């Protein structure tokens, strides 16, 4: 009965939602036609009198180039005609176009579709927003959608699945401006924000998964596996089930900090899991290694604050507790002094499912680790340094000012994140 609304915004949102709803359909045995060959599906698949299931997701994009691929491909008959909302002109990698001029005309249609989908939800848990920082739509439209959603719906949970710029490579030039201007806005109107990038998944898929030539589909399938392992507690039955409210409560101590890191174990191919033993100790010491996290930052520089572990499959709480005790005994992991009890555990019975033509092996047990750390301030300081080094010479400013905002928004957006950096060091100071 308990159900959540998925909102994917931007090209990243659409091409992640493709490989995510593929995994949802395969897990619940939902055909691409829309019919089940024959109530746990009701968390994502709403019934119809003809036995046909339609998802509780909203795809939004300001260009129809990828939505037409969705409407043309294998999953044409599954998604609703009105659950895929398109604009005529894209944001063209501009926060001003995303927030004030182009992103202002379709927000009424998007809000109407959200209200219509929420009216049929008997008990609603919250919203999960899939988007990217480096895009004009995925910054500006997501910012204004967050504003209007927070005004309309009061105390629903808001979780973010956010594609953050990689520290070395990226796909744009003005992504520091876009990142600064949307992270200034989404701080107040969000509850939790899982953060990912692309180079860390490239390194994972090269070192661990043994293909030297990856693709966005290979990235998106791992992201969809992580999202499914997050919502698996609501979907299926287990010894200890977690909820959206539960790991919103159990992961952030302060309202100004809502930035964890996501890690998944094990990642391995079909050739190697044939030989390597997959035990609870090894899958829980895989996560704590710095080479296996999906954000290019080293947790040895920082201090942990809270950790939430989600276990799926043939797992035993005795070995879970023994492995957690070994982790607590091992010294190189540091914790802040004001959190003596740092762990949350959730248990689910069903082992993960694999996709035909897939890359991951068919495993027995898996774990997803969501950990708040102070070692995101390093990456944020690098992005702030890039923002200052760009803003010193007033480059790329006329694009922003000629489409609706004034020039003081840049100053306010830098100063508030400087204050958040100060709050990061204040939290990281030992008592």
């Amino acid at each position: 009965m308990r159900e959540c609304i998925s909102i994917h915004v931007g090209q990243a949102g659409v091409q992640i939602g493709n490989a995510c709803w593929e995994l949802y359909c395969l897990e619940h045995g939902i055909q691409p036609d829309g019919q089940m060959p024959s109530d746990s599906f009701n968390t994502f698949f709403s019934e119809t009198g003809a036995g046909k299931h339609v998802p509780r997701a909203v795809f939004v994009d300001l260009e129809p180039t990828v939505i037409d691929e969705v409407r043309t491909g294998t999953y044409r008959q599954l998604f609703h005609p009105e659950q895929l909302i398109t604009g005529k002109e894209d944001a063209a990698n501009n926060y001003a176009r995303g927030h004030y001029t182009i992103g202002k005309e379709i927000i009424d249609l998007v809000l109407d579709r959200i209200r219509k989908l929420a009216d049929q939800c008997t008990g609603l848990q919250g919203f999960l927003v899939f988007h990217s920082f480096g895009g004009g739509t995925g910054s500006g439209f997501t910012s204004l959608l967050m504003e209007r959603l927070s005004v309309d719906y009061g105390k629903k949970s808001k979780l973010e699945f956010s594609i953050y710029p990689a520290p070395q490579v990226s796909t744009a030039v003005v992504e520091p401006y876009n990142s600064i201007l949307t992270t200034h806005t989404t701080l107040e109107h969000s509850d939790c924000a899982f953060m990912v990038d692309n180079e860390a998944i490239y390194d994972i898929c090269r070192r661990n998964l043994d293909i030297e030539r990856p693709t966005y589909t290979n990235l998106n399938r791992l992201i969809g596996q992580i999202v499914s392992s997050i919502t698996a507690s609501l979907r299926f039955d287990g010894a200890l089930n977690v909820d959206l409210t539960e790991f919103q409560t159990n992961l952030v101590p302060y309202p100004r900090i809502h930035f964890p890191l996501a890690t998944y174990a094990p990642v391995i191919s079909a050739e190697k899991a044939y030989h390597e033993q997959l035990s609870v100790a090894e899958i829980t010491n895989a996560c704590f290694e710095p080479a296996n996290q999906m954000v290019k930052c080293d947790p040895r520089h920082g201090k942990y604050m809270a950790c939430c572990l989600l276990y799926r499959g043939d797992v035993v709480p005795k070995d879970v507790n023994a492995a957690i005790a070994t982790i607590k005994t091992k010294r190189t992991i540091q914790f802040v002094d004001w959190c003596p009890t740092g762990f949350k555990v959730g248990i689910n019975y069903q082992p993960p499912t694999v996709v035909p033509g897939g890359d991951l092996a068919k495993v027995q047990r898996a774990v997803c680790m969501l950990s708040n750390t102070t070692a995101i301030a390093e990456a944020w300081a690098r992005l702030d340094h890039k923002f200052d080094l760009m803003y010193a010479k007033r480059a790329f400013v006329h694009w922003y000012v000629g489409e609706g905002m004034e020039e003081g928004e840049f100053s306010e957006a830098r100063e508030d994140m400087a204050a958040l950096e100060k709050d990061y060091e204040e939290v990281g100071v030992d008592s």
Binding site: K88, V169, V174, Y216, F396
Partner: protein, 426 residues
């Protein structure tokens, strides 16, 4: 959905447009008759971008063809692909421009623009959502530099929001084919820097250099020179009409490439070039595209990038490909060539991915580059213009038709200020 209105003027613009409208008739599988003969279904999903639907399943281009002389219409209408262009889209006068900017901008181009503006405004309102404009002309001539830069001012005052793109034929010192050509080149630069959002400078000498060492042609005629140019316009708008992994329309390129409103001068390149005997041996791979793309002899402009500094660099990829090799090859050329990029803009490289490669090919990449070294091109014009103006040479063809000398004294001032504007950020 997002319709591109092609414009061409002069003799050079007409011959490039005859070859440009040939390769996207090949890419969309359109026969010289006008119908559709293709095999896939991806060709017809975005065909209203460049072609107008008619009765009987006939697709006609959204292009206008302007010249003051009717000589070059006869070769276009009798060419290999001459029956596709609409007869109402040929606008022609009876008196030629004759390598004078005043004839194209004040006397003979004064009344001809009223007939073109009727044609353009009909095709402008025929689009559901007009993406912008595109133009191809010659600076060294009379009609292209005269009337073409007169239309650029007249279109810009009508639709200010739409993007303007220009593919210019900038002059050459050694391959010079006109005597009075620094006058026509200088006076059109003022009319470009105010009313244009993107400028792709193509020069005649660099194309002869490419076809000699890379394609190894014995007799590189204009049909070979126009075709390398014709491949560039297809490779820049390839995401506006085909599905991909990371789309980039014309507004996407101008946002990344242009930090300041007067820095809208590019220099282009096309990555996969090799001769027929060298096709079956060289394995076309993403490292091979990257290595050839950044070469100095590879470029279509008469400027050496080693004497300047890249401000921003764009790269639009076509074909089926991975992205990890693309992300680390753009990163490796940014780390090793640290002295070839400015240090006040991090991440000078923009990448885009499409799915469909050009026909006859399997992977391709089009290079658009904003470089400081474009001012080397503009200084050669400026030093020639002063040498002619100090002796008042050839001026009676200009001041004797209704033009003041102040347009000469002001056009040298703007060109001098721009070449001093690039020099500061070096």
């Amino acid at each position: 959905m997002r319709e591109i209105v092609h414009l061409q003027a002069g003799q050079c613009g007409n011959q490039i447009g005859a070859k440009f409208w040939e390769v996207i008739s090949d890419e969309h599988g359109i026969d010289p008759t006008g119908t559709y003969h293709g095999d896939s279904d991806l060709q017809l999903e975005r065909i209203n971008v460049y072609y107008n639907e008619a009765t009987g399943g006939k697709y006609v281009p959204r292009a206008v063809l302007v010249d003051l002389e009717p000589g070059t219409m006869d070769s276009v209408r009798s060419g290999p692909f001459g029956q596709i262009f609409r007869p109402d889209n040929f606008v022609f006068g009876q008196s030629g421009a004759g390598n004078n900017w005043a004839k194209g901008h004040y006397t003979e181009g004064a009344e001809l623009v009223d007939s073109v503006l009727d044609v353009v405004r009909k095709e402008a309102e025929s689009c559901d959502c007009l993406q912008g404009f595109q133009l191809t002309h010659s600076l060294g001539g009379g009609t292209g530099s005269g009337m073409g830069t007169l239309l650029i001012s007249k279109i810009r005052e009508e639709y200010p929001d739409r993007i303007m793109n220009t593919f210019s034929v900038v002059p050459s010192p050694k391959v010079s084919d006109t005597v009075v050509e620094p006058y026509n080149a200088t006076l059109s630069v003022h009319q470009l820097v105010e009313n244009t959002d993107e400028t792709y400078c193509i020069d005649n000498e660099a194309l002869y250099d490419i076809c000699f060492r890379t394609l190894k042609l014995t007799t590189p005629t204009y049909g070979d020179l126009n075709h390398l140019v014709s491949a560039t316009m297809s490779g820049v708008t390839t995401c506006l009409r085909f599905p991909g992994q990371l789309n980039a329309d014309l507004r996407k390129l101008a946002v990344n490439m242009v930090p300041f409103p007067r820095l809208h001068f590019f220099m282009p390149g096309f990555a996969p070039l090799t001769s027929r005997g060298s096709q079956q041996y060289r394995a076309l791979t993403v490292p091979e595209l990257t290595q050839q793309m950044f070469d100095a002899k590879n470029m279509m402009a008469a400027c050496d990038p080693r004497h300047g500094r890249y401000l921003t660099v764009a790269a639009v990829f076509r074909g089926r490909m991975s992205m990890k090799e693309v992300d680390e090859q753009m990163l490796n050329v940014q780390n090793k060539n640290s002295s070839y990029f400015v240090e006040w803009i991090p991440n000078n490289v923009k990448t885009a991915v499409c799915d469909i490669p050009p026909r006859g090919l399997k992977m391709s990449a089009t290079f658009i580059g904003n470089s400081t070294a474009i001012q080397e091109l503009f200084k050669r014009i400026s030093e020639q213009f002063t040498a002619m103006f100090r002796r008042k040479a050839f001026l009676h063809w200009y001041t004797g038709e209704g033009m003041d000398e102040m347009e000469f004294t002001e056009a040298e001032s703007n060109m001098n200020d721009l070449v001093s504007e690039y020099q500061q950020y070096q």
